[PDB]
């Protein structure tokens, strides 16, 4: 059955992104005397790991590593509304995996608050949804140019051109929102460490602005 | 309408190029105790968000996010006069916005200069001059050798070269002019904040280090 | 330098409301690094903390008083006040309202110089 | 939440001897975030040490405090006449915010 190695290179691919990416925010100088944090390496490996499992699992899945992502897919007809459960199901269980992983095997001086996002404490909830929405808007539109078939000048590699899109929405908003993007990225650590607050603009931020992308590509732009 | 598509294009891809490559220079240590400049941080957001655009947008508009590219095509035939009044009126509108949004979302303590580019104290204007016709004549080289189809040798990635090429502009010229090599992407932030101090080298720099990349690659070396 | 004086019925029966108005002189909420919240002092006890706001809008409460508390800032008039509902006879005390200091990176609230 | 624990609850002594306050913290406190203010019976707190450390514009030289991790002090090289009041110490390297219990000083 195709449809079962499908779910489970979701599952598959969901759990190394988040143990490998969240293992990049841990702060190795404890609660004592904090290290500077370094913006280039969270950013680097946040995207450099997506870059990665859409190369592993494109072939197998189609790469969508993401929930936000395959709603997308989902109202453009792209995948079918019960293929697209299964799909956000397995990703939410890899995050909650690699996450529960993550916790194991790192030493409790330095857990920390084990990679969860937050929003600035000076930045209203109200801005905060709009920075994720924004960031995740040019997230969606990329993978769309990128995979679109009608396409003849589309050159170099399409997994390392996603990746770089998730950079560069670190490398802004990590000090704003905490750079999400990913609705299961937040959903993982969340359920372990049950941090809860402000977690729904992870929810509806990223949703909205991947189907504003999806739509407004398929339907506008090229269609 | 496919011309209203393109102007469309320009206008988005120059408003989210704007909001998260300037999102990247907020120094977060505030006015009080402002933290150690990161450039690495700086150069990549600005040289991968031109990346992304140009693989985004490509096809639909022509990739240009830049008042200084679009002159350069029109002197050697490449878009009609017409075309490109709309393409810089709409890539200045496009930074006005982005930059405005950054200023909603950014708390009063962090917005500092809002990513204005200055002038070194101990540069003379004669010399910034100079420093930006040479950061912006290597960029326009790339974009018609890239381009250029008369050519079978190009491999890789088109859009991810000339993010490389922006890439490193900055890596240089942050510290004497804060590397512009976009007349909209000073507009922008000039507008919200009001700085209008050595502005005009920011047009004519840019301007004149284009047309003799482009009048020199197609009409010396590849006519 | 930056001044602070509160204002407030002083008499509340039990079950209604408590509206407490801070009125800030020499200082301007929008154009600064600092929050706004309020302390209370129950008579024969120590200081407790109850919530702030930013000029933004975002506030931050105690947890053990985020159901009841809510604070509100008007920039216009240059004050910030106080709604605390359900009151009882426990919550009689001395209330200050108080100057934020805070940390530009993450947003949290550090002491509390000065006092009203 | 952190829970501050100061003692003795009340601290005599003569006037001109030397007062040492302790302020002591359930769990580790990052970057040395406690701060330590001054009441007098009947008027708004006052800040004197913030970061354990670091003291404010315009107090005494003779309020001095320091330490680290769990245990924090604040030492009064000479006592004044008006130095006999509440003391209250405050962490903040984790929210919820929280204070001390206080610790009055009289005169023996």
């Known amino acids: 059955q195709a449809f079962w190695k499908a779910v489970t290179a979701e599952f598959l691919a969901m759990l190394i992104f988040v143990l490998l990416s969240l293992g990049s925010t841990i702060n190795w100088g404890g609660t004592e005397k904090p290290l500077p944090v370094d913006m280039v390496l969270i950013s680097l490996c946040f995207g450099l790991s997506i870059a990665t499992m859409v190369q592993c699992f494109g072939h197998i899945s189609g790469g969508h590593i993401n929930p936000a992502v395959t709603v997308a897919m989902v109202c453009t007809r792209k995948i079918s509304i019960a293929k697209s459960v299964f799909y956000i199901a397995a990703q939410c269980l890899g995050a909650i995996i690699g996450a529960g992983i993550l916790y194991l095997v790192t030493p409790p001086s330095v857990v920390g608050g084990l990679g969860v996002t937050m929003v600035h404490g000076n930045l209203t909830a109200g801005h905060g949804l709009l920075v994720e929405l924004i960031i995740t808007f040019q997230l969606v539109f990329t993978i769309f140019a990128s995979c679109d078939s009608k396409r003849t000048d589309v050159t170099g590699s399409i997994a390392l051109a996603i990746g770089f899109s998730v950079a560069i929405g670190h490398l802004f908003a990590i000090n704003y929102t905490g750079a999400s993007m990913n609705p299961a990225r937040s959903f993982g650590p969340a359920v372990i460490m049950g941090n809860w607050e402000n977690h729904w603009i992870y929810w509806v931020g990223p949703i909205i602005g991947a189907v504003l992308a999806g739509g407004l590509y398929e339907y506008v732009f090229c269609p | 309408q496919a011309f209203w598509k393109a102007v469309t294009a320009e206008f988005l891809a120059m408003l989210i190029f704007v909001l998260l490559s300037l999102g990247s220079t907020i120094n977060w240590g505030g006015t009080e105790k402002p933290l150690p400049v990161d450039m690495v941080l700086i150069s990549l957001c600005f040289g991968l968000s031109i990346a992304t655009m140009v693989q985004c947008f490509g096809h639909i508009s022509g990739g240009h996010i830049n008042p200084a590219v679009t002159v350069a095509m029109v002197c050697t035939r490449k878009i009609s006069i017409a075309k490109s009044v709309f393409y810089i009126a709409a890539q200045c509108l496009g930074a006005i916005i982005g930059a405005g949004i950054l200023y909603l979302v950014t708390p009063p303590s962090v917005v500092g200069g809002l990513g204005v580019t200055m002038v070194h104290g101990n540069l003379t204007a004669g010399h910034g001059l100079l420093v930006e016709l040479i950061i912006t004549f290597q960029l326009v080289f790339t974009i018609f050798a890239s381009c250029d189809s008369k050519r079978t040798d190009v491999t890789g990635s088109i859009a991810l070269a000339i993010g490389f090429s922006v890439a490193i502009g900055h890596l240089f010229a942050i510290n004497y002019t804060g590397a512009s090599m976009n007349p909209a992407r000073s507009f922008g932030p000039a507008v919200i904040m009001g700085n209008w101090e050595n502005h005009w080298i920011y047009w004519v720099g840019p301007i004149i280090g284009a047309v003799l990349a482009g009048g020199l690659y197609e009409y010396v070396f590849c006519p | 330098q930056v001044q602070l004086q509160e204002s407030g019925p002083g008499l509340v029966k039990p079950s209604q409301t408590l509206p407490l108005t801070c009125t800030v002189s020499?200082?301007?909420?929008?154009?600064?690094?600092?929050?706004w919240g309020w302390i209370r002092q129950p008579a024969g006890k120590g200081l407790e903390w109850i919530g702030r706001?930013?000029?933004?809008?975002?506030?931050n409460y105690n947890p053990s008083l985020k159901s009841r508390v809510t604070i509100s800032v008007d920039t216009s008039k240059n004050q910030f006040s106080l709604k605390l509902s359900s009151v009882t006879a426990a919550d009689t005390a001395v209330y200050y309202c108080?100057?934020?200091?805070?940390?530009?990176?993450?947003?949290?609230?550090?002491?509390?110089?000065?006092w009203g | 939440e952190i829970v501050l624990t100061q003692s003795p609850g009340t601290l005599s002594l003569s006037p001109g001897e030397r007062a040492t306050l302790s302020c002591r913290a359930s769990?580790?406190?990052?970057?040395?975030?406690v701060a330590w203010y001054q009441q007098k019976p009947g008027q708004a707190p006052r800040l004197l040490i913030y970061?354990?450390?670091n003291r404010a514009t315009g107090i005494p030289d003779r309020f001095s405090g320091s330490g680290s991790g769990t245990d924090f002090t604040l030492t009064i090289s000479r006592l004044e006449p008006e130095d006999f009041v509440v003391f209250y110490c405050?962490?903040?390297?984790?929210?919820?915010?929280?204070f001390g219990g206080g610790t009055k000083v009289e005169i023996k």
């Open positions: 769990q580790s406190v990052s970057s040395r975030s």
């Open positions: 706001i930013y000029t933004s809008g975002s506030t």
């Open positions: 020499g200082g301007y909420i929008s154009s600064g690094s600092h929050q």
């Open positions: 970061g354990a450390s």
């Open positions: 108080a100057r934020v200091n805070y940390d530009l990176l993450t947003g949290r609230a550090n002491f509390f110089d000065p």
């Open positions: 405050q962490q903040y390297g984790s929210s919820p915010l929280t």
